[PDB]
Design a protein around this ligand. Structure first.
Ligand SMILES: Nc1ncnc2c1ncn2[C@H]1C[C@H](O)[C@@H](COP(=O)(O)OP(=O)(O)OP(=O)(O)O)O1
Ligand SMILES: Nc1ncnc2c1ncn2[C@H]1C[C@H](O)[C@@H](COP(=O)(O)OP(=O)(O)OP(=O)(O)O)O1
Ligand SMILES: Nc1ncnc2c1ncn2[C@H]1C[C@H](O)[C@@H](COP(=O)(O)OP(=O)(O)OP(=O)(O)O)O1
Ligand SMILES: [Mg+2]
Lengths: 874, 89
């Protein structure tokens, strides 16, 4: 055994040097009277033995170890023996002599580090790294952001570079060490996006022949030069609609604001660049502000004032005040643009029309469309079939054809009404096990529940199943009319005059519905009668189901496939110093509704009955997003009366402006064809729809708040003169567009304040930017807090240092009681003419808890519910 | 439309021969999107489910067709059922 001295030399391993060292430390804390002590000597030689033994235990016949490796094991032996005073003075003294070595080494230091790395160009030529341009992009990137250190990033980058780096991976190196900093300061996310933009500018501009490279503020003059170059190459490759050349590109080139690139989060820019920016040969040649300008232009190709409206639409989009739906963003400004990709259908009870509906499913899904299918009219197991002289097997064998079409065309949701004789088989279609002939693992399902069924649940009544072919009028009836006609058929079956039927207990079927929702996630629960009694289009059709995402309530028939034309307001951009900017909200809603009305005319239609319904009724669906983040800005916890109040009044405000905007389009473009007879014609607004719903169903089964903070009487008058759209509002999921704009999803509570993305190199944690901002004000943002958040997967509950006001404000989806989410949705639904996609989160998971929850959802006048997220751990 | 015809012609026990050779094979470009075709078998699955639901159908494929090897195994008793059509000849 030998030891590597501090500097090179090798010497034999001598226990004495260890024994002397430890003895020095004992004699330092004690006096000299400890010099001759059997105790010290016995202790030291014991510590020296277990140290020397440790080196023997890990190695065979001799070896070599570092001098510091021995010092560490000496401290270990002293420490494990509980020698606190001797161990710490050993550490202190040892560190004092390390300081003298470190300092003396720095005094004798010589400086060589030079020159610089040579950046390799694409053509293969070497070039010295530009330090001036490197400082420019990182400074313009840290511009306007707090607690960001540009010099810190430049130093950490400069480390991981080698002679012969390419300018390609010099930017990625800047990005790599920029997102590693978002964990301790979220504002680096903006810095990370601004650095990545440098690659995009070089990529796009170099492709367009404008410039081989450029900085941010250099875009103040280059965005106008790049736009006409972009349109010319875009149309050349048939990636952009040639009609866009009819715009005044010089005027639009000046309207572009290059500073809005600074708004992007890293995730938002990645999203657009990966999937939305136009490209050729893998090269993205569409820059972000030109992307927003393309969408604006595509939405204005038929406006009288092309440029003025295009600028109005570009300003709304590029500022993140509002964001068009995913299909609009992707296809606006391109040939035959699919601007809407959400449809509702109803399937007729004949074989030709069944397979006509299968055919429509395939065509509508050819470009990623989502579908709701009303299958209630199709006759159930045991029904007679003339011509065949046999008996039907019901809807499920046809749903299997639907299921395999969805697989073949690359989602769809089937709806069935609760008295349908196939309902029991329907509830089990998504079980993991069992007969596969009775499963549709690639198709969604939803219950179309009449009020009467829930009434029978509340009252422990019975419930009769029928085949629709024996009761063909029930599906189209609703409200009192349905309940009278249904009880007539019920009495008929009890007197043997309607053979094909099944009597069950309503509570038993209800329990089966909730257990399948819990076990399989399906079928979802949607309510037929509020969707129909509150539909503004009752005079010209019937709502036969909702859509794939359960927020749309539009009529369907033989000649009408309803189309959802969607967009969402960004509530975050309408919160100022803690308050809702009522004034700015009206301006954004007015422009949003116009853009959505334009979508109807520009949209390219594949099936004629989808064009027919859109042109006849002109429904749109204006939603919201950033609700949870808007609560943060007001310091309102989602589980409070104050959040329920904000949800009520914010929807009432948007609703007023949205309805008012539709009146303005009616003055300019004329009311939609079927306006005459609609609820709007009768002066029955959504707030009035709630009142009549309570009258119809009865206060015994529904209770909803009816408060109002605005004056609707003047608007209730102007609406009767005409509006442009049969439906205005719908709150849909906003997965992509919330990520693009950097806000929370629609109305969802935060699912978790922390997530650990891991998809390239290492894993990068992302923490709720609002949570960290509040923890700074309290002075509670530090390394230990970060280590606690990871341990608790982002939950601020049960960490002592956070005060209770923040534990409540940053409660996660599974630690907010479900009643808050339902009551909030209930008050938003008072002002929405369609519905809202409502995910529910339930910890504890019991059939009892599901019962009280979905009874409450119905009792509070909700039209739809969506996914159930259930945990049985609590 | 061809699948619609199958259901209508089978409505009263009729028998069918379907030529599927013109439908493009796995890997073919589709200008509908910018993706690749998964071949004829995913549509034959719809034919299979239609024979079952309307209950008789024989699908034909030419020997140079690039999906032929999957086609040859559609009636094996074992294996991935998404690559099988047990109710279709
Ligand atoms: N022969 C050896 N075998 C094993 N460990 C040794 C040996 N010599 C020294 N050590 C260990 C024990 C102590 O922790 C430390 C000795 O410190 P010290 O006696 O000051 O020697 P050193 O390497 O620092 O040289 P110096 O005489 O300049 O102090 O290193
Ligand atoms: N006065 C003291 N108090 C505490 N520990 C001591 C004292 N004197 C010696 N020791 C311990 C810790 C040291 O590692 C070791 C003494 O060796 P020493 O050579 O003086 O220090 P060192 O090896 O860490 O640095 P260097 O040799 O470079 O001066 O024994
Ligand atoms: N061969 C079959 N296999 C399975 N289901 C069938 C078959 N033929 C008919 N059906 C089902 C599909 C529809 O739900 C229902 C009605 O079929 P359809 O073709 O419309 O007859 P029909 O409408 O001309 O006469 P009717 O409705 O008066 O009995 O029967
Ligand atoms: Mg020493």
């Amino acid at each position: 055994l030998r030891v590597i001295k501090r500097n090179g030399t090798v010497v034999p391993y001598t226990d004495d040097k260890i024994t002397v060292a430890i003895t020095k430390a004992f004699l330092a804390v004690e006096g000299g009277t400890a010099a001759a002590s059997s105790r010290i000597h016995d202790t030291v030689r014991r510590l020296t033995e277990q140290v020397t033994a440790t080196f023997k235990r890990r190695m065979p016949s001799g070896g070599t170890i570092h001098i510091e490796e021995i010092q560490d094991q000496v401290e270990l032996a002293l420490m494990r023996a509980g020698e606190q005073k001797v161990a710490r003075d050993y550490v202190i003294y040892r560190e004092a002599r390390a300081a003298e070595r470190k300092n003396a080494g720095a005094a004798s230091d010589v400086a060589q580090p030079h020159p610089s790395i040579r950046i390799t160009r694409a053509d293969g030529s070497l070039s010295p790294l530009d330090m001036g341009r490197l400082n420019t992009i990182i400074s313009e990137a840290c511009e306007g952001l707090a607690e960001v250190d540009g010099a810190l990033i430049e130093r950490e980058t400069l480390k991981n570079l080698y002679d012969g780096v390419a300018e390609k991976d010099v930017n990625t190196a800047l990005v790599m060490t920029a997102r590693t900093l978002v964990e301790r300061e979220p504002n680096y996310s903006y810095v990370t996006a601004r650095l990545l933009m440098d690659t995009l500018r070089a990529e796009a501009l170099g492709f367009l022949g404008v410039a081989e490279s450029a900085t941010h503020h250099e875009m103040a003059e280059l965005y106008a030069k790049a736009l006409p170059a972009y349109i010319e190459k875009g149309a050349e490759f048939e990636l952009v609609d040639a009609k866009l050349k009819e715009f005044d590109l010089e005027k639009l080139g000046k309207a572009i604001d290059h500073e809005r690139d600074q708004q992007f989060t890293y995730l938002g820019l990645q999203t657009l660049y990966d999937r939305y920016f136009i490209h050729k040969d893998g090269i993205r040649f569409e820059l972000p502000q030109i992307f927003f300008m393309r969408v604006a232009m595509g939405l204005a190709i038929e406006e009288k004032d092309r440029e003025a409206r295009a600028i109005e639409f570009y300003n709304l989009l590029s500022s993140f005040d509002y964001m068009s739906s995913t299909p609009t963003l992707f296809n606006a400004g391109t040939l035959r643009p699919q601007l809407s990709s959400c449809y509702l259908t109803t399937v007729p009870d004949d074989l030709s029309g069944i397979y006509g509906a299968i055919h429509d499913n395939a065509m509508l899904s050819k470009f990623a469309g989502g579908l709701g299918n009303d299958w209630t009219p199709v006759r159930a197991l045991g029904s007679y079939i003339k011509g065949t002289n046999g008996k039907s097997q019901g809807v499920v064998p046809f749903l299997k054809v639907v299921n395999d079409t969805a697989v073949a065309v690359n989602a769809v949701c089937a709806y069935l009404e609760t008295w349908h004789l196939d309902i029991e088989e329907f509830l089990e279609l998504r079980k993991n096990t069992g007969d596969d002939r009775r499963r549709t693992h690639d198709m969604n399902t939803a219950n179309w529940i009449p009020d009467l069924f829930m009434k029978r649940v509340f009252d422990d009544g019975s419930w009769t199943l029928f085949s629709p072919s024996d009761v063909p009028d029930l599906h189209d009836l609703y409200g009192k009319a349905f309940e009278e006609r249904y009880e007539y058929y019920e009495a008929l079956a009890s007197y043997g005059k309607l053979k094909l039927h099944k009597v069950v207990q309503a509570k038993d079927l209800w329990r089966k519905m909730l257990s399948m929702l819990f076990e399989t996630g399906h079928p979802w629960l949607t309510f037929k009668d509020p969707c129909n009694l509150r539909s503004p289009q009752q005079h010209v059709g019937v709502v036969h189901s909702s859509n794939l995402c359960t927020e749309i309530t539009l009529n369907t028939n033989k000649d009408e496939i309803a189309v959802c034309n969607l967009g969402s307001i960004n509530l975050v951009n309408h919160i100022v110093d803690g308050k809702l900017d009522t004034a700015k909200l009206e301006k954004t809603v007015k422009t949003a509704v116009r853009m959505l009305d334009n979508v109807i005319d520009i949209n390219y239609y594949s099936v004629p009955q989808a064009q027919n319904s859109n042109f006849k009724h002109r429904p749109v669906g204006l939603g919201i997003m950033g609700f949870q983040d808007a609560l943060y800005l007001q310091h309102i916890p989602y589980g409070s009366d104050a959040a329920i109040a904000f949800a009520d009044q914010s929807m009432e405000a948007i609703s007023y402006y949205a309805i008012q905007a539709s009146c303005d389009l009616a003055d300019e473009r004329g009311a939609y064809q079927t306006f005459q007879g609609s609820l709007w014609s009768q002066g029955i607004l959504p707030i009035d729809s709630e009142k009549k719903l309570i009258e119809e169903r009865g206060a015994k089964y529904i209770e909803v708040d009816l408060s109002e903070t605005l004056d609707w009487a003047p608007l209730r008058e102007r609406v009767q003169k005409g509006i442009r759209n049969s439906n205005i509002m719908a709150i849909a999921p906003t997965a992509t567009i919330a990520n693009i704009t950097g806000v929370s999803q629609s109305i969802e509570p935060t699912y978790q304040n922390l997530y650990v993305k891991s998809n390239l190199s290492g894993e990068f944690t992302v923490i709720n930017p609002y949570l960290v901002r509040d923890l700074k004000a309290r002075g509670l943002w530090d390394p230990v807090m970060v280590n606690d958040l990871k341990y608790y997967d982002g939950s601020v509950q049960q960490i002592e240092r956070i005060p209770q006001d923040l534990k409540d404000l940053y409660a996660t989806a599974f630690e907010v009681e479900t009643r808050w989410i339902v009551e909030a949705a209930s008050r938003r639904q008072k002002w929405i003419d369609q519905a809202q996609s409502l995910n529910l989160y339930i910890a504890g998971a019991s059939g009892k808890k599901l019962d009280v929850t979905y009874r409450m959802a119905w009792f509070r006048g909700l039209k739809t519910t969506y996914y159930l997220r259930a945990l049985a751990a609590t």
